[PDB]
Amino acid sequence: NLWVTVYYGVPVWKDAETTLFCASDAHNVWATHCCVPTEIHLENVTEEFNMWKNNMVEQMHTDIISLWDQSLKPCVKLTPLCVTLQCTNVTNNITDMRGELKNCSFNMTTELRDKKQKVYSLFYRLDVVQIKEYRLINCNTSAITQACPKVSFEPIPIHYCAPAGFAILKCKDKKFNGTGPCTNVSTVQCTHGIKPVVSTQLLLNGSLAEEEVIIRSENITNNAKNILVQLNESVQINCTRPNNNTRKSIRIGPGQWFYATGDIIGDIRQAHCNVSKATWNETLGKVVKQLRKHFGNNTIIRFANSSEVTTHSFNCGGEFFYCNTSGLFNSTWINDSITLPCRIKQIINMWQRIGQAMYAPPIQGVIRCVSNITGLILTRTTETFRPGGGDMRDNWRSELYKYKVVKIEPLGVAPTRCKRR
Amino acid sequence: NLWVTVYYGVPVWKDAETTLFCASDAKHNVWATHCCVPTDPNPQEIHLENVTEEFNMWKNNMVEQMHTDIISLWDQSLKPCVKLTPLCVTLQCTNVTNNITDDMRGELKNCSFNMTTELRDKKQKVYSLFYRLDVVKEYRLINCNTSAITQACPKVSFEPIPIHYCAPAGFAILKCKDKKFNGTGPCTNVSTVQCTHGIKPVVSTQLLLNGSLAEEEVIIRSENITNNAKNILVQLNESVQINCTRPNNNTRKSIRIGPGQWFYATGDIIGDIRQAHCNVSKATWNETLGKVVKQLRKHFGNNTIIRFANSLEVTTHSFNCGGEFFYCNTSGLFNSTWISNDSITLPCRIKQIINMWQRIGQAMYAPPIQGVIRCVSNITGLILTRDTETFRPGGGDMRDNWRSELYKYKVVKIEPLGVAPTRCKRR
Amino acid sequence: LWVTVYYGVPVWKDAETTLFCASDHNVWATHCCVPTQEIHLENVTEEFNMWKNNMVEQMHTDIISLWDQSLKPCVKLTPLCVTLQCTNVTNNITDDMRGELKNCSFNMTTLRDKKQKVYSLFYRLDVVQIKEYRLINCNTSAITQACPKVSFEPIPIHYCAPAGFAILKCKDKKFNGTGPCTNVSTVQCTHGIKPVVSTQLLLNGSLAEEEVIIRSENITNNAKNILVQLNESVQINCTRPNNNTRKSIRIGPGQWFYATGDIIGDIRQAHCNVSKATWNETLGKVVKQLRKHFGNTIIRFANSSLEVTTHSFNCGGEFFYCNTSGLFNSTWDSITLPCRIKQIINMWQRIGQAMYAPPIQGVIRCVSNITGLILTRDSTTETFRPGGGDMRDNWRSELYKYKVVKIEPLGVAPTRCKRR
Amino acid sequence: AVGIGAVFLGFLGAAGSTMGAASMTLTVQARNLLSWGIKQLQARVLAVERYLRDQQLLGIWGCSGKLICCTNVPWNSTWSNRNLSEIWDNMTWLQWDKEISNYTQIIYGLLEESQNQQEKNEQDLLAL
Amino acid sequence: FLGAAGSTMGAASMTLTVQARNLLSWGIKQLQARVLAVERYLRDQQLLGIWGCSGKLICCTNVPWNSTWSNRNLSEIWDNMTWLQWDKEISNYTQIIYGLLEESQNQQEKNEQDLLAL
Amino acid sequence: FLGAAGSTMGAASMTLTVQARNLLSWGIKQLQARVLAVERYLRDQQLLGIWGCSGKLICCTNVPWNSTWSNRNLSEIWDNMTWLQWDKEISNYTQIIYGLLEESQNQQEKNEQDLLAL
Numbered sequence A: 001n002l003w004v005t006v007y008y009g010v011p012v013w014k015d016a017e018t019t020l021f022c023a024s025d026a027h028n029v030w031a032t033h034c035c036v037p038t039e040i041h042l043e044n045v046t047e048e049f050n051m052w053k054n055n056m057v058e059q060m061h062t063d064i065i066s067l068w069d070q071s072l073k074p075c076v077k078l079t080p081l082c083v084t085l086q087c088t089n090v091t092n093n094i095t096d097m098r099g100e101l102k103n104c105s106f107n108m109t110t111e112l113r114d115k116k117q118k119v120y121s122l123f124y125r126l127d128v129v130q131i132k133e134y135r136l137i138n139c140n141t142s143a144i145t146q147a148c149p150k151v152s153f154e155p156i157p158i159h160y161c162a163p164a165g166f167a168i169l170k171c172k173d174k175k176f177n178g179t180g181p182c183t184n185v186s187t188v189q190c191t192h193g194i195k196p197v198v199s200t201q202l203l204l205n206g207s208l209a210e211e212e213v214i215i216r217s218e219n220i221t222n223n224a225k226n227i228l229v230q231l232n233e234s235v236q237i238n239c240t241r242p243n244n245n246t247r248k249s250i251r252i253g254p255g256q257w258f259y260a261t262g263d264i265i266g267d268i269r270q271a272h273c274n275v276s277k278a279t280w281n282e283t284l285g286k287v288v289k290q291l292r293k294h295f296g297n298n299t300i301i302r303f304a305n306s307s308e309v310t311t312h313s314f315n316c317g318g319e320f321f322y323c324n325t326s327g328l329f330n331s332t333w334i335n336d337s338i339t340l341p342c343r344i345k346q347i348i349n350m351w352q353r354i355g356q357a358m359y360a361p362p363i364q365g366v367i368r369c370v371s372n373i374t375g376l377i378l379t380r381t382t383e384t385f386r387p388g389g390g391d392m393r394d395n396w397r398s399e400l401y402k403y404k405v406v407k408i409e410p411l412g413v414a415p416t417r418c419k420r421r
Numbered sequence B: 001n002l003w004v005t006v007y008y009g010v011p012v013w014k015d016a017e018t019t020l021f022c023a024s025d026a027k028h029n030v031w032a033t034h035c036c037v038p039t040d041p042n043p044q045e046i047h048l049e050n051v052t053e054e055f056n057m058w059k060n061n062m063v064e065q066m067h068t069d070i071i072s073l074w075d076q077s078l079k080p081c082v083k084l085t086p087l088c089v090t091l092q093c094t095n096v097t098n099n100i101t102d103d104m105r106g107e108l109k110n111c112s113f114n115m116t117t118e119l120r121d122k123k124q125k126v127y128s129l130f131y132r133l134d135v136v137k138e139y140r141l142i143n144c145n146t147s148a149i150t151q152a153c154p155k156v157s158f159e160p161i162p163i164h165y166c167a168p169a170g171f172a173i174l175k176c177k178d179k180k181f182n183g184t185g186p187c188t189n190v191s192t193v194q195c196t197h198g199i200k201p202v203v204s205t206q207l208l209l210n211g212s213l214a215e216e217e218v219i220i221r222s223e224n225i226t227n228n229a230k231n232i233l234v235q236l237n238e239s240v241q242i243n244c245t246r247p248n249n250n251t252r253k254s255i256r257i258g259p260g261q262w263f264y265a266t267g268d269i270i271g272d273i274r275q276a277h278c279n280v281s282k283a284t285w286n287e288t289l290g291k292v293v294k295q296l297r298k299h300f301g302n303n304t305i306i307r308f309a310n311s312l313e314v315t316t317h318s319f320n321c322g323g324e325f326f327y328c329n330t331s332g333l334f335n336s337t338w339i340s341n342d343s344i345t346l347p348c349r350i351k352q353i354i355n356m357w358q359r360i361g362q363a364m365y366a367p368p369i370q371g372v373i374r375c376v377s378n379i380t381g382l383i384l385t386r387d388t389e390t391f392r393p394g395g396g397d398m399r400d401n402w403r404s405e406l407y408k409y410k411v412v413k414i415e416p417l418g419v420a421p422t423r424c425k426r427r
Numbered sequence C: 001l002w003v004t005v006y007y008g009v010p011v012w013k014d015a016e017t018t019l020f021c022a023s024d025h026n027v028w029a030t031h032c033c034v035p036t037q038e039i040h041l042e043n044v045t046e047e048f049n050m051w052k053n054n055m056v057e058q059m060h061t062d063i064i065s066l067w068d069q070s071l072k073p074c075v076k077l078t079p080l081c082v083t084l085q086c087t088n089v090t091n092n093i094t095d096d097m098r099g100e101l102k103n104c105s106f107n108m109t110t111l112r113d114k115k116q117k118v119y120s121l122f123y124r125l126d127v128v129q130i131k132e133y134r135l136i137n138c139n140t141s142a143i144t145q146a147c148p149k150v151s152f153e154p155i156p157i158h159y160c161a162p163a164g165f166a167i168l169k170c171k172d173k174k175f176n177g178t179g180p181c182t183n184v185s186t187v188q189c190t191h192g193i194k195p196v197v198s199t200q201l202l203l204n205g206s207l208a209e210e211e212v213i214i215r216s217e218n219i220t221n222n223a224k225n226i227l228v229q230l231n232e233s234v235q236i237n238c239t240r241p242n243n244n245t246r247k248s249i250r251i252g253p254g255q256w257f258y259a260t261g262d263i264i265g266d267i268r269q270a271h272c273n274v275s276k277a278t279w280n281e282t283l284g285k286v287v288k289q290l291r292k293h294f295g296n297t298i299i300r301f302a303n304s305s306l307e308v309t310t311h312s313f314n315c316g317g318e319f320f321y322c323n324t325s326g327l328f329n330s331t332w333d334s335i336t337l338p339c340r341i342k343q344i345i346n347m348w349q350r351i352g353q354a355m356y357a358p359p360i361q362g363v364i365r366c367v368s369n370i371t372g373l374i375l376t377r378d379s380t381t382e383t384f385r386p387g388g389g390d391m392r393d394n395w396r397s398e399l400y401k402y403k404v405v406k407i408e409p410l411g412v413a414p415t416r417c418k419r420r
Numbered sequence D: 001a002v003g004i005g006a007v008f009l010g011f012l013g014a015a016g017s018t019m020g021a022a023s024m025t026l027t028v029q030a031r032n033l034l035s036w037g038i039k040q041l042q043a044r045v046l047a048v049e050r051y052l053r054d055q056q057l058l059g060i061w062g063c064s065g066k067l068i069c070c071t072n073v074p075w076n077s078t079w080s081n082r083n084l085s086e087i088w089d090n091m092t093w094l095q096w097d098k099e100i101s102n103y104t105q106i107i108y109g110l111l112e113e114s115q116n117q118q119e120k121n122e123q124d125l126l127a128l
Numbered sequence E, F: 001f002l003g004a005a006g007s008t009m010g011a012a013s014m015t016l017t018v019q020a021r022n023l024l025s026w027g028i029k030q031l032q033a034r035v036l037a038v039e040r041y042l043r044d045q046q047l048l049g050i051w052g053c054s055g056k057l058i059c060c061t062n063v064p065w066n067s068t069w070s071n072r073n074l075s076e077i078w079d080n081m082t083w084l085q086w087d088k089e090i091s092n093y094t095q096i097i098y099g100l101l102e103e104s105q106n107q108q109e110k111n112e113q114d115l116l117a118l
């Protein structure tokens, strides 16, 4: 003779997809976006996680693309530059690159409808396509928009926070490989501080593994999938563009300005990155040991050069570097440094789209940055692995793999011995 | 001694005007990307016994909502599209004389012009064919003065699909099921529905296409039938089938006019050149018109004489067919005198620059459609005006095309709170 | 005693929130699409501070946003940023307007493959020499023509609190903008403020109940403005005497430019009339209540040292820049102030935007009330100068008596009561 | 109650039924009330505001949590001088609502006053 | 918050003020989040109200428990299982139970209205 | 509405209904204001509910008054003071009292269930 009793505030939940909002630790595009300023252990909860079927990654990806476009939307367009250029090579003080820099002159608009001006600027070879008669790339598909020089795209930590009624569960299993049950689950309000760093092949400034190198994949036997390798120790990489650049601001219209690369002071030298050699050899040895566990006890593993996918492709100081990683991925496993040459581009077709293009104003001075390699993206009777990637969602999966969003459903019933009357 | 007792959840309502949302069934269509809520496969309807409700078509806010939504979607879909401002230049035009039949003499022009291109320092010589109705040997496009012309994006479909208008929480839609219902008046067979039947947002003049049919007899409806200032909508008992075609085999000439900016021009016709036309079954039309007359005779006198006569977008039958825009001559249909006691061919014109709702500065350029176009459609109703008496195929106010489908629906607000006396006192 | 809990308690704290606008082709009439009570609080003493009042900041967010929205969907005049071939108007000048009006011709766009020669009149303030001239603002920003069908005439508007908030009003006739106030009442909306935009003189505002009330954030600080409210108005009437016409030029596909056409009748200088005694009594009253802060001494009024140095206002549809040097002149039947008129207006002290005010046809005459002054200060003697700029001080002068508070109707107290 | 579980009439099914019958379907009517971008948010916000305004009103009268609430305000013959058998057995709620539309402000004010007095009286008795 | 989630039902029932008080508190994403929290909150509070449990975290009803829904005794249900487990065990009977609770309240309210008539 | 603000607590407590009725009733800012009014309203109602005072403007609880919070006599608090003053005075105890109110109700609610079972 038991009766139905209704309980509200019950600790029960279901998997869910919702809208997360961004918080931050209190100009920069994310600082403006992440307007909200900024852990409970569940003693006997086992929960199932799956980083490959997550929604947080899709939502983060969407927010980044959207914010990026919003940032460029109000900036001056460079459609006045889709004219024929007269380009010759820069020959002064060139070390040995040769055809990388060109001195281009052209007929451009002015603030008056009835007046024209002759200007010149330097361009990188990769941004200019030959028809001495040249034009900028694109100008056929997409218009080029100049990024505002006052807007910062420096990544800052982003904290995704649950809306009321929802919670984020975090997996603390030290060796969690992205899927399946996790026995160390805690509840959090915000997903830690994650930096939206954009690169391919080598993932910079992410989280480190705590005990060993961890290799994660959707299907380890499916050669079509990317393998995300999380390192337990970082590898330091020192990148620079040694040339002393200047900038010329050209009025192109009524309050509209174009930023052109001006004369380079001193020698023209190649941009490059210095990877510590001993650290790199130890790093791969650890990766290989963990790979052998999946590819065979006596399987020989070799690394090889890949075939804006084959390059590192990262944003350093605001410039876009396309470094040659073939200097790293070349070995067989059964004070020195590795110098990787880097190409520089100003016209960027970002996020694998072609209907839009950005022009990055040149940055004056000399640029240097030092970054932490925290993980690798690899693609697959010996085995050979190559760098891969380019799909940005796979970078974000490396930081959000331990989080899951659930909906709280605090209402239910159970039998007991009381009657209402 | 009676006391006030409060009841919450009381089944009452008041007439109200609110915003309805669009639902669609489980289908780059302009409606499909708007009517994002899937409808129920087995939708709810509740019959209300002993409820008499007064319905009024000309006070029905659902029509204004639909009209407004149509304009909004059509204008919104043209925002992210190529503008044709660069075409408002002088053109050099001559007549097309290649294999033209007599019915098409003078209908097509061959025009050349100096167009923009990828770079600002370059120009190109291009040419295209135009229909006579779209141009002013020195020609201009017909509407460049106090206007802008926007090319509709070729990927976007404007094909009508069934649209369901559904109530928000707190509201309900009441439906009149009286088979004889003629508007403005009480209905004794009222049911509550979650939302309307699917309505196809077909845009046309004079003849209503692909709508509902009357259950038993032709129904003549108007706000005030003796008033010549009001239109008469006629809902037919059976459909009349009409076969429309654009027999010429067209091609599409794609011109790059800027950095990803494309213009789609009409290219040369393959095969010979013939006039567009519609085939209306003749026997059906005669009988159909006779049915309308029998009902008209319930008004204006039992023994009188009824005549039908004819009256661009108002005097011709305007409709979309395959994405193309037709303007057909209906004088071949509205030509009769009725007294007590195989097919008709309607020639049609084609027009490419479109001003859909009595507006001047917003013109759309319809891209040419490759191949040959054939449409089969149902005439489900007529729009008539009144001057022995004479009726004519008037129209042009698009609200009438929606008023004819939404006539049986009313929106009310649910107000579930009230009081009544009883023998109960709070302790 | 036991804890007891009450809900509906009359308690509030200072708060900053969004207010909505109510009104009893005008831009405020269109925006404030809300239709239009007072409760006295007998023993409530409340603390007010007009210099830290968020309602002021809200008006200087709403007025600007509305202004910019209204001008957004209008014809841009970018096609006019050409070199003009331009000379002087010399006919019917009768002095004091020599070189004031320019007669400019230029090559304008129209089909895309055609051009036209047009001409128009301009005031010299809008034209810069580069006989080659440019519009003054084409070097920095595109000029947008205001839509002629849109009225920017100020109408009274009311700021209303959202549910849960209340506006408290100070009734102390001697209130100087800060500190405690007795006789506080609760209202749902403000009294109706006309958003008149002007410099130096505050037109068509409220009057003081008595005398002259002189308010400032710090009276001894020369870096602060002094806002002076009068209890009597000074009647001022301004005219643009010329009979003007418009020349409507099509510049593109339904895009019209409204140019000044020509002048019918003689050409005359714009001007404003102020009565002599009214002004003399007004300044004497200001001095009488001003000495109270400085000692009994010489108080001098002197002139200013375009938008700030002249009295800027919108008369009818045209922007006047009047010379007040003959108004503020004293060491303690009428006088006139000569005026200039400009058509390219840079509002709210921004430089990245410019508006072209289309010409007004006919003759403009406006009659208005001076309700207060903006003065600055900068030895046994001192000098007061007309001030201006910022434009928030123009609203502080009406909003000084109001504050917004948030009601928090929940709390506890001890009592002789237990459950069951 | 029989077979698998309870069944109910549909929303407004009782609209044409008399008050004495329709009063038994209050749980249907009270259940179905629980449900560009700016337009949809406005529609949702409004539905919530309307809902809460009615719940607020029931609470201030001491009727929160009940679909049927007896009160301490007597019925005036001037609001409606009618027999209960006619009201409950021979009339619908739509008809009743039309007849009592000029007295609802009066009734609501009386209900608010009665509840305020009752809560004070309860506090005074708990105090003993 | 969810700290009691791994505990048995008989333990976790004492932490219901928590996750009650914690359930309600580019652009429009934040409005959508605020509106959603409110709408969900009200659907649950109003559902308790229609069942006659307004204002309570724990309410007794007049609906008997059917051994079909669950044939376990109280010792297993309250001492061995947690709330997530229980929710799964009777998930397919939830709608039946809710309908019965609404029916029960409707009958109770009518009966109280009649007793108050005496 | 706020006229009672100038009266003592013992008088103002008789005008609670008049305030409760006034708590409810680009363009985004006005939509945000409407949403906030709803959220604030519901939060206050949630607290009254969780403390066991749902539906009441005046209620009593079983949490005793602590002389630390206030050492005044009732003849001073209710007769010679207003609510604005009282609120300014009890500024360091609001959160403490609220936590105690939730704890008391949770214990009372469990006790009610155990009693109904016997």
Ligand SMILES: *[C@@H]1O[C@H](CO)[C@@H](O[C@@H]2O[C@H](CO)[C@@H](O[C@@H]3O[C@H](CO)[C@@H](O)[C@H](O)[C@@H]3O)[C@H](O)[C@H]2NC(C)=O)[C@H](O)[C@H]1NC(C)=O
Residues within 6 Å of the ligand: A154, A155, A197, A204, A205, A314, A315, A316, A317, A318, A368, A369, A370, A371, A372
């Ligand atoms: C990985 O994290 C490191 C920091 O640990 C990032 O390096 C830092 O990058 C910022 C932005 O590029 C540099 O700030 C700038 O410094 C120059 C002076 O050289 C100054 O003129 C600018 O106004 C600005 O403040 C910062 O100095 C630099 N820190 C170091 C140690 O070099 C690195 O960029 C991150 N990697 C990636 C791929 O994002």
Ligand SMILES: *[C@@H]1O[C@H](CO)[C@@H](O[C@@H]2O[C@H](CO)[C@@H](O[C@@H]3O[C@H](CO)[C@@H](O)[C@H](O)[C@@H]3O)[C@H](O)[C@H]2NC(C)=O)[C@H](O)[C@H]1NC(C)=O
Residues within 6 Å of the ligand: B159, B160, B202, B209, B210, B319, B320, B321, B322, B323, B374, B375, B376, B377, B378
């Ligand atoms: C009235 O309803 C009828 C039937 O739904 C409509 O006719 C259909 O119209 C569509 C769109 O014009 C035709 O689809 C096209 O068919 C060609 C066939 O080669 C295909 O290549 C296209 O991609 C597209 O799928 C459909 O065939 C046609 N059906 C018939 C029987 O002709 C009619 O258009 C509606 N009338 C009005 C005014 O809306």
Ligand SMILES: *[C@@H]1O[C@H](CO)[C@@H](O[C@@H]2O[C@H](CO)[C@@H](O[C@@H]3O[C@H](CO)[C@@H](O)[C@H](O)[C@@H]3O)[C@H](O)[C@H]2NC(C)=O)[C@H](O)[C@H]1NC(C)=O
Residues within 6 Å of the ligand: C153, C154, C196, C203, C204, C313, C314, C315, C316, C317, C365, C366, C367, C368, C369
């Ligand atoms: C201070 O308030 C007075 C009203 O008490 C304002 O005077 C009014 O100003 C408007 C705009 O200048 C005048 O409107 C125009 O009137 C002419 C007819 O003369 C009409 O053709 C126009 O279409 C327009 O409606 C209005 O007549 C005038 N009222 C009076 C009684 O003269 C004054 O402008 C305000 N001061 C300031 C600085 O705004």
Ligand SMILES: *[C@@H]1O[C@H](CO)[C@@H](O[C@@H]2O[C@H](CO)[C@@H](O)[C@H](O)[C@H]2NC(C)=O)[C@H](O)[C@H]1NC(C)=O
Residues within 6 Å of the ligand: B049, B050, D016, D017, D018
């Ligand atoms: C619609 O109205 C009719 C009366 O016009 C209702 O008929 C009554 O139904 C009850 C059901 O218990 C019978 O006891 C009465 O004898 C019937 N009256 C007559 C005159 O036959 C009918 O129930 C109403 N419909 C609804 C849904 O309430």
Ligand SMILES: *[C@@H]1O[C@H](CO)[C@@H](O)[C@H](O)[C@H]1NC(C)=O
Residues within 6 Å of the ligand: A236, A237, A238, A274, A275, A276, A337, A370
């Ligand atoms: C990067 O520069 C720092 C400067 O102190 C140096 O210590 C470090 O070894 C360099 N790293 C590499 C990989 O060369």
Ligand SMILES: *[C@@H]1O[C@H](CO)[C@@H](O)[C@H](O)[C@H]1NC(C)=O
Residues within 6 Å of the ligand: A305, A306, A307, A310, A326
């Ligand atoms: C590295 O790969 C590229 C293709 O991405 C190929 O052209 C190049 O020759 C390769 N170099 C070496 C050393 O394998």
Ligand SMILES: *[C@@H]1O[C@H](CO)[C@@H](O)[C@H](O)[C@H]1NC(C)=O
Residues within 6 Å of the ligand: B093, B094, B095, B105, B106, B109, B137
């Ligand atoms: C086409 O021919 C007609 C006569 O049939 C003539 O009037 C018209 O001007 C011609 N049009 C052109 C473009 O030559």
Ligand SMILES: *[C@@H]1O[C@H](CO)[C@@H](O)[C@H](O)[C@H]1NC(C)=O
Residues within 6 Å of the ligand: B090, B092, B112, B113, B114, B125
């Ligand atoms: C294009 O411009 C040239 C300029 O000399 C002119 O001769 C030619 O006829 C124009 N062509 C067309 C098709 O308008």
Ligand SMILES: *[C@@H]1O[C@H](CO)[C@@H](O)[C@H](O)[C@H]1NC(C)=O
Residues within 6 Å of the ligand: B145, B146, B360
């Ligand atoms: C275009 O010009 C013709 C005269 O050439 C005129 O009749 C017509 O009305 C004008 N169009 C508009 C929209 O004014």
Ligand SMILES: *[C@@H]1O[C@H](CO)[C@@H](O)[C@H](O)[C@H]1NC(C)=O
Residues within 6 Å of the ligand: B216, B217, B218, B237, B238, B291
């Ligand atoms: C409607 O059509 C049916 C056959 O479908 C026919 O029997 C009936 O007579 C028609 N109605 C009228 C008014 O003729």
Ligand SMILES: *[C@@H]1O[C@H](CO)[C@@H](O)[C@H](O)[C@H]1NC(C)=O
Residues within 6 Å of the ligand: B182, B183, B184, B185, B220, B221, B222, B225
């Ligand atoms: C429609 O029906 C109403 C019923 O009252 C009648 O008054 C009206 O005249 C009818 N109109 C037509 C055109 O049949």
Ligand SMILES: *[C@@H]1O[C@H](CO)[C@@H](O)[C@H](O)[C@H]1NC(C)=O
Residues within 6 Å of the ligand: B224, B226, B227, B228
């Ligand atoms: C209906 O039309 C007649 C003229 O045919 C007119 O006299 C009558 O007033 C109209 N009805 C109404 C309600 O105006």
Ligand SMILES: *[C@@H]1O[C@H](CO)[C@@H](O)[C@H](O)[C@H]1NC(C)=O
Residues within 6 Å of the ligand: B241, B242, B243, B279, B280, B281, B282, B343, B376
């Ligand atoms: C229209 O076409 C159909 C076949 O699709 C045919 O059966 C019908 O008879 C045709 N009607 C006319 C009027 O030709």
Ligand SMILES: *[C@@H]1O[C@H](CO)[C@@H](O)[C@H](O)[C@H]1NC(C)=O
Residues within 6 Å of the ligand: B310, B311, B315, B331
């Ligand atoms: C109407 O038909 C007559 C022939 O009966 C014809 O002369 C007239 O031009 C036609 N008008 C229209 C607009 O079709």
Ligand SMILES: *[C@@H]1O[C@H](CO)[C@@H](O)[C@H](O)[C@H]1NC(C)=O
Residues within 6 Å of the ligand: B249, B270, B371, B372
């Ligand atoms: C149009 O002509 C092309 C020529 O290749 C042919 O393939 C196509 O089938 C024709 N279209 C029609 C509808 O006959």
Ligand SMILES: *[C@@H]1O[C@H](CO)[C@@H](O)[C@H](O)[C@H]1NC(C)=O
Residues within 6 Å of the ligand: C085, C105, C106, C107, C117, C118
């Ligand atoms: C227009 O351009 C021609 C080019 O030769 C020039 O001679 C003429 O003076 C210009 N007219 C004006 C008003 O600028």
